[PDB]
Ligand binder design. Structure first.
Ligand SMILES: Nc1ccn([C@@H]2O[C@H](COP(=O)(O)O)[C@@H](O)[C@H]2O)c(=O)n1
Length: 379
């Protein structure tokens, strides 16, 4: 029959990983592909090279009904190769299962490849610390069965349910942190349950690509020559990393912008609590979804080189263009950054802190008192 590959992610990290998958399998120009990556626009010059390449919008963390129109274009027997965001897996696959129900004779799920949204999955797991994990797993598999058979969603534990897909399909999990699963003792039952169905995100994949594929990849993630050259300068560098929010909208978005600018000053100003030194060239790597928050930094800071917000930080690691130091608000990017390059990681207020616990458990931060940006004086 025929295999159809779907790349779905409303966030950044899973999409970054999925674009690598696309690059590795980019030779086949006719393999049907459906892209549902909210934060990525595949360049037109690349699209034209492929046939049976489709695009679908995501709304409320699930592909829209426009997905059914695409699938109807393949009348034969089709096996779905689905790539998903782990945190949002249940909703992202919802429309796919609904379609399958109506075309049970020709539509089947071939396999699932799941990738971490980022720190979110770990913060969520951290909250399950006092649960009987072994029992939570059994209940989740049961409720997953109910979802697969009735199409209805009802999970007593939405978090653990994200990890019981193997009970229904061939699966492969790609974790931002395999250490968390080994260091969090309360999760031992889960680690054992997952058996050989997981691996850590492979950040060395880019280096294994051919010279042609690496350029294909760089084009997909937006890493142009101008940015590359700005990072090839000879001088110690410091990249300030931004964050974003979705809380209280406007008011909170403006609070975030102001606290982030103040944070930057604490790193770059001689009188700052986190002053890095004067020999560093300053760069700003804003959050992909920072929006007005990123603009606030550029409009109110000086002598700072902007690295387009849409360019995922990990790309610098892949290209071997990491700076000497990195500092900013807690982010998923710090999970794969070499410890020697960490300046300071600051946490946001606006409510024990689950995120703090996760990074401490992984040794990303030490036992010392954590810095929340609401405790930094206005410079
Ligand atoms: N300042 C930032 C913040 C996040 N990011 C990318 O977005 C992802 C998720 O980041 P957050 O955990 O900060 O939301 C990361 O894995 C990183 O790829 C970035 O490239 N630059």
């Amino acid at each position: 029959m025929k295999t159809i590959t779907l790349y779905l992610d409303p966030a950044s990290l899973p999409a970054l990983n999925q674009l690598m998958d696309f690059t590795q399998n980019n030779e086949d120009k006719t393999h049907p592909r459906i892209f549902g990556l909210s934060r990525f626009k595949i360049p037109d010059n690349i699209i034209t090279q492929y046939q049976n390449i489709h695009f679908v919008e995501l709304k409320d963390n699930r592909p829209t009904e426009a997905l059914f129109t695409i699938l109807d274009q393949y009348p034969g027997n089709i096996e779905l190769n689905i790539h998903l965001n782990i945190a949002h897996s249940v909703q992202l696959i919802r429309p796919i299962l609904a379609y399958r129900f109506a075309h049970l004779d020709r539509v089947s799920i071939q396999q699932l490849n799941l990738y971490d949204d980022g720190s979110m999955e770990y913060v969520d797991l951290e909250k399950e610390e006092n649960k009987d994990i072994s029992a939570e797993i059994k209940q989740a598999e049961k409720q997953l069965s109910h979802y697969l058979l009735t199409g209805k969603i009802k999970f007593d534990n939405p978090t653990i349910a994200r990890y019981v897909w193997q009970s229904a399909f061939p699966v492969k999990y790609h974790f931002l942190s395999t250490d968390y699963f080994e260091k969090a003792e309360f999760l031992q039952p889960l680690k054992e349950y997952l058996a050989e169905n997981y691996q850590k995100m492979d950040w060395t994949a880019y280096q294994q690509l051919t010279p042609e594929q690496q350029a294909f990849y760089l084009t997909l993630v937006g890493f142009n020559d101008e940015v590359k050259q700005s990072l090839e300068v000879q001088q110690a560098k410091f990249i300030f990393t931004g964050t974003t929010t979705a809380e209280g909208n406007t008011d909170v978005r403006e609070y975030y912008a102001q606290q982030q600018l103040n944070l930057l000053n604490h790193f770059t100003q001689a009188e700052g609590d986190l002053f890095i030194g004067d020999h560093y060239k300053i760069y700003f790597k804003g959050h992909p979804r920072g929006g007005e928050i990123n603009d606030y930094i550029l409009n109110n800071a000086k002598n700072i080189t902007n690295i387009p917000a849409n360019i995922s930080f990990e790309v610098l690691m892949m290209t071997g263009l990491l700076p000497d130091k990195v500092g900013g608000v807690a982010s998923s990017l710090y999970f794969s950054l070499p410890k020697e390059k960490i300046s300071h990681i600051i946490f946001t207020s606006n409510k024990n802190n689950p995120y703090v616990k996760v990074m401490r458990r992984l040794g990303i931060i030490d036992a010392s008192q954590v810095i929340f940006w609401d405790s930094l004086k206005q410079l």
